[PDB]
Structure 1
């Protein structure tokens, strides 16, 4: 039992910092093709290999985290922005944007650790208003006319996670009397909030700059046989999470006492809804008449009515 506790809460408490130096001496052309470029090409070939299900690929799951954690009062802000751009250039001029796109497209819309890692890598590679990586991704998606990436994004947005009340009620009933484990793993109520916020932050960074071309490509994929409206998928997920938060309020409507578990679930729901709203803002910002009409001709109005109701009552 002592060894189990030592493994659990003594060693993995952030006791190392090696991602930046590792990426550096892997990109250093000691002398051809750099080692980092060889690794990126290996991951790209593995993602392009025709299969029926994305494998676990512990190597990829362990190196995407490193490549993502490597990245990240006027002169110091500009200098740190330039350093972030330099790191993104260092680890994206070797084809990491194409690697992330291929890894997302080779999942068929199945939520998993590979998709989580590749979304974290996409976030760390598109952090800020990086337009070079956005243009690279757009040119890749245009030169390879594929609907797999877009349908995978649609499936992920459709089956990522939604707050549910039945699991919360069952957890309350279990913790009321069962003290064998105390249910310290507050899951099954909001499955992967981290993954949901990562996906929607990846979309927000894809539409970070006012790229009218990318904002229209995310709506109508011109050149492809079948198109899927990422905007409609996003507003549908917003409606779903709004209904979930409304039901959670209806549950916590009358007792006027919010326990720690309820507070944590509410905070996670608020974070997810805030990320979705930020993604919608990045979608509609600028005179994007297409996305403006798409949001005006949907159930966003019902969603925002429910949101105003829950806002007033919860506040």
Structure 2
């Protein structure tokens, strides 16, 4: 109610809720002393499990409804960001209760169309800003928490929420999966990037956002959810070309000075490609991927990754592990393509 007039008060309340949900923090010897003294003066009389219990408590209080209503009816960027952060904190850890509450609120609420419309408008503005610039703009920055929130919304392989995100039972339906795919496609340079110039577009600045977008795509695809895989594979934007180019091509500028980010990006891309055909007996997706993903280039990439183990130094992802993931992907793709199957055979 107070957001209409006391916007600062609403922001403060949201931040206080987020702090309550957040874990304890140490503030130094003096800070600890003051905290203990204040707690004793006031409170004279008296782990993921605790966080989940607090999340359930807040949901019972109506935190999910509060954040949804604020996002729907907020015209201030700060309030929207605070609401998105609070929603992320509530969904932290992939709690089933919070996801079910979100789903029920979206279904029962009459403004679900408005909620998804606001999300879709933010996404389109972010893509437009990314196209125009190609630091970070405000839209591209706010897209990151939105993607994180959607990923937590679809975490733990929840069929109902993934389907709801892909399509809604409203007069106007906004698809978030295709919007995320378009955002990733535009970040990477579109056809120009997919034609081997992807390295120029990708930089350490946007590498984190690209990785987050790829992880969100994998979360959408896994489960497996055949509809999401079909939409991503057959999308007109041809983002699968960019996904394939990520693995096939090496980002020269970023890799030259920072290689761990390259390793994480390639690992995420390989995981996404594997998720694209988790349980797909039909072969059209495999043919579409093979069109962008050449057999000889794929086997060459795998062989290079195996011998790239020296790069594991100061790296959290083994190049051989990424090579093994790409090898599994190539094995799955082999049955459709005879040349790939023949190449994958050892000497």
TM-score bracket, normalised by the shorter chain, equals: 0.5 to 0.7
Partner of 1:226: 172
- Report the 3-state secondary structure (helix = DSSP H, G, I; strand = E; otherwise coil) of the residue aligned with 1:141: helix
User: Where in structure 1 are there 5+ consecutive unaligned residues?
Assistant: 1-41, 47-53, 73-79, 168-186, 254-261
- Report the 3-state secondary structure (helix = DSSP H, G, I; strand = E; otherwise coil) of the residue aligned with 1:226: coil
Cα separation, 2, equivalents of 1:115 and 1:268? 24
Cα separation, 2, equivalents of 1:284 and 1:252? 25
* CA gap 1:166/1:199 in 2 versus in 1, 3 angstroms: closer
- Structure 1 residues 134-192: Cα deviation after superposition (integer angstroms, max 9, x where no partner): 1111111111243101111101111136557869xxxxxxxxxxxxxxxxxxx4x4435
- Report the 3-state secondary structure (helix = DSSP H, G, I; strand = E; otherwise coil) of the residue aligned with 1:159: helix
- Which of residues 232, 237, 246 is equivalent to 1:307? 246
CA contact (8 A) 1:104 1:153 kept: no
- Structure 1 residues 202-255: Cα deviation after superposition (integer angstroms, max 9, x where no partner): 111111121101111111112x112111111111111111118959x96996xx
- Which of residues 70, 75, 98 is equivalent to 1:103? 70
* CA gap 1:197/1:164 in 2 versus in 1, 3 angstroms: same
Partner of 2:101: 136
Partner of 1:57: 7
Matches within 5 A, 1:60-209: 60-72=10-22, 80-107=47-74, 112-146=77-111, 147-160=113-126, 162-163=129-130, 187=135, 189-191=136-138, 194-209=141-156
Cα separation, 2, equivalents of 1:151 and 1:230? 10
How many residues end up aligned between the 2 structures? 224
The Cα RMSD (Å) is 3.1
Cα separation, 2, equivalents of 1:291 and 1:93? 32
Cα separation, 1, equivalents of 2:109 and 2:221? 26
User: Where in structure 2 are there 5+ consecutive unaligned residues?
Assistant: 23-46, 256-347
- Structure 1 residues 108-144: Cα deviation after superposition (integer angstroms, max 9, x where no partner): xx78111111111011111011111111111111112
- Structure 1 residues 60-81: Cα deviation after superposition (integer angstroms, max 9, x where no partner): 1122112112223xxxxxxx01
Larger Rg, first or second structure (1 or 2): 2
Cα separation, 2, equivalents of 1:98 and 1:144? 9
Bigger relative contact order (CA 8 A; separation at least 6): 1
